[PDB]
């Protein structure tokens, strides 16, 4: 096997960052008085 | 609007808690924390307790060993401590999902605070696990698989795989959800 | 504590915390069923599918 881990790490950081920005969107809904 | 928005974000926070519990379970179970590299002598990967190593004959033939229910097979004490702390985090986050039921009877704000504390503690446990796990790389098995250059707190030839970065993501998600729970519990009081 | 509350008032629930003890059975009627149904799901999915 091609012992390289870039695409896997790429999708992982992508989904993690997506969850994190959508959490920050939850705060945008919250703190917006 | 105010009650509607608070209810909506509270439900979204519950879904986030469920998602983080899924993340914690999969990172604890799947043993893909660190993997081989092109320069590695012998192919394989290893998680918190389970580790698979290749025989090294231009084939896969991965021999796999390790299991949390038998601490003897775990390579090193640091691995044992990391596994225990991640298990404790799992117990806490799973406990939070159970507490959800208290919303039927108890006051909302107090239970929000209970989970805020639980999720903070789970984040701390995950932080401790991720901090102590690199200490075990000086064990003979990981050194043999990765090579002699690897040592304590040194990746060396081996490279990180998806489970470790997912663990870091879980730490951030847990801490931020804990803050969200605190703010919501204080916001419901108004 | 950006809301302006005290640290104890913000994080910890030190305002009345026990007074409500008689309602444990009402509490346990969901707390115990939920934990086990939740425990079984992680246990079974762990062995059959994830490992
Ligand atoms: C695979 C893992 C699955 C996880 C499964 C998790 C499920 C765990 C089991 C039971 C949960 C029971 C939840 C009961 C919530 C009911 C709470 C409720 O009645 O609504 C009000 C709003 O509360 C609230 O904002 C709380 C909202 C709670 C929202 C969370 C529950 C919905 C879970 C949706 C499922 C998504 C699954 C998707 C996973 C991919 C509060 O009442 P209330 O003011 O009148 O009282 C005032 C007081 O003085 C006397 O009651
Ligand atoms: C009968 C039923 C009633 C009893 C139930 C009691 C409930 C207890 C609960 C938790 C504590 C678990 C204590 C388990 C202690 C069991 C005793 C024990 O640990 O055995 C030692 C090692 O075993 C091991 O590696 C295993 C060590 C790890 C044990 C931890 C497993 C997870 C337990 C899950 C807890 C979830 C809680 C969630 C509740 C909400 C023996 O060493 P020894 O040199 O001879 O080996 C030589 C070598 O060549 C072979 O390993
Ligand atoms: C197998 C179950 C069959 C029976 C169905 C459940 C009975 C539902 C009938 C309503 C019961 C009810 O709400 O009153 C009991 C308490 C409140 O007590 P009270 O002080 O108002 O009298 O309020 C509560 O505690 C809410 C009821 C929660 C019951 C949870 C049942 C879980 C069953 C687990 C199955 C594995
Ligand atoms: C009380 C409630 C809220 C929490 C219950 C926590 C449960 C889900 C925990 C406690 C001990 C855990 C187990 C401990 C050890 C192992 C061995 C491992 O190879 C697969 C996962 C598995 C099988 C775990 C699955 C989840 C588990 C059963
Ligand atoms: C098993 C059920 C465990 C119940 C634990 C107590 C829940 C919260 C009790 C109310 C606390 C308060 O006064 O706000
Ligand atoms: C898709 C694989 C899900 C594995 C189990 C997740 C359990 C979440 C906590 C109940
Ligand atoms: Cl195991």
From Swiss-Prot, chain A:
Function summary: Transmembrane scaffolding protein involved in cell-cell interactions via its interactions with neurexin family members. Mediates cell-cell interactions both in neurons and in other types of cells, such as Langerhans beta cells. Plays a role in synapse function and synaptic signal transmission, especially via gamma-aminobutyric acid receptors (GABA(A) receptors). Functions by recruiting and clustering synaptic proteins. Promotes clustering of postsynaptic GABRG2 and GPHN. Promotes clustering of postsynaptic LHFPL4.
Native species: Homo sapiens (Human)
Region (Required for interaction with LHFPL4) location: 11-31
Transmembrane portions of the chain: 11-31
Name of this chain's protein: Neuroligin-2
Subunit structure: Interacts with neurexins NRXN1, NRXN2 and NRXN3. Interaction with neurexins is mediated by heparan sulfate glycan modification on neurexin. Interacts (via its C-terminus) with DLG4/PSD-95 (via PDZ domain 3). Interacts with PATJ. Interacts with GPHN. Interacts with MDGA1 and MDGA2. Found in a complex with MAGI2 and IGSF9B, where it interacts with MAGI2 (via WW 1, WW 2 and PDZ 2 domains). Identified in a complex of 720 kDa composed of LHFPL4, NLGN2, GABRA1, GABRB2, GABRG2 and GABRB3. Interacts with LHFPL4; leading to mutual regulation of the protein level and synaptic clustering.
Tissue specificity: Expressed in the blood vessel walls. Detected in colon, brain and pancreas islets of Langerhans (at protein level). Detected in brain, and at lower levels in pancreas islet beta cells.
Origin: domain of life: Eukaryota
Family: Belongs to the type-B carboxylesterase/lipase family.
Localization (cell): Cell membrane; Postsynaptic cell membrane; Presynaptic cell membrane
Curated annotation (Swiss-Prot), chain B:
Main location: other
The keyword Membrane is annotated on this UniProt entry: yes
Membrane topology: Multi-pass membrane protein
Entry's transmembrane regions: 9-29, 84-104, 114-134, 165-185
Keywords associated with the record: Cell membrane, Cell projection, Membrane, Postsynaptic cell membrane, Synapse, Transmembrane, Transmembrane helix
GO BP: gamma-aminobutyric acid receptor clustering; neurotransmitter receptor localization to postsynaptic specialization membrane; regulation of inhibitory synapse assembly; sensory perception of sound
GO molecular function annotations of the record: GABA receptor binding
A single cellular component GO annotation: plasma membrane
Location(s), subcellular: Cell projection, Dendrite; Postsynaptic cell membrane
Family to which the UniProt record says this protein belongs: Belongs to the LHFP family.
Free-text function comment from the UniProt entry: Plays a role in the regulation of inhibitory synapse formation and function by being involved in maintening gamma-aminobutyric acid receptors (GABAARs) clustering and their associated scaffold proteins at inhibitory synaptic sites. Acts in concert with NLGN2 to recruit or stabilize GABAARs.
Assembly mode: Interacts with GABA(A) receptor subunits. Identified in a complex of 720 kDa composed of LHFPL4, NLGN2, GABRA1, GABRB2, GABRG2 and GABRB3. Interacts with GABRB3. Interacts with GABRA2. Interacts with GABRG2. Interacts with GABRA1. Interacts with NLGN2; leading to mutual regulation of protein level and synaptic clustering.
Protein name per its UniProtKB record: LHFPL tetraspan subfamily member 4 protein
Source species: Homo sapiens (Human)
Gene: LHFPL4
Portion held of the full protein: 14 to 203 of 247
Curated annotation (Swiss-Prot), chain C:
Transmembrane spans: 27-47
Post-translational modification: Palmitoylated by ZDHHC3/GODZ; required for the accumulation of GABA(A) receptors at the postsynaptic membrane of inhibitory GABAergic synapses.
Subcellular location per the Swiss-Prot or TrEMBL entry: Postsynaptic cell membrane; Cell membrane; Cell projection, Dendrite; Cytoplasmic vesicle membrane
Coiled-coil positions: none
Protein family (similarity comment): Belongs to the ligand-gated ion channel (TC 1.A.9) family. Gamma-aminobutyric acid receptor (TC 1.A.9.5) subfamily. GABRG2 sub-subfamily.
Record text on subunit structure and interactions: Heteropentamer, formed by a combination of alpha (GABRA1-6), beta (GABRB1-3), gamma (GABRG1-3), delta (GABRD), epsilon (GABRE), rho (GABRR1-3), pi (GABRP) and theta (GABRQ) chains, each subunit exhibiting distinct physiological and pharmacological properties. Interacts with GABARAP. Interacts with KIF21B. Identified in a complex of 720 kDa composed of LHFPL4, NLGN2, GABRA1, GABRB2, GABRG2 and GABRB3. Interacts with LHFPL4. Interacts with SHISA7; interaction leads to the regulation of GABA(A) receptor trafficking, channel deactivation kinetics and pharmacology.
The protein, known as: Gamma-aminobutyric acid receptor subunit gamma-2
Residues of the full protein shown: 416 to 475 of 475
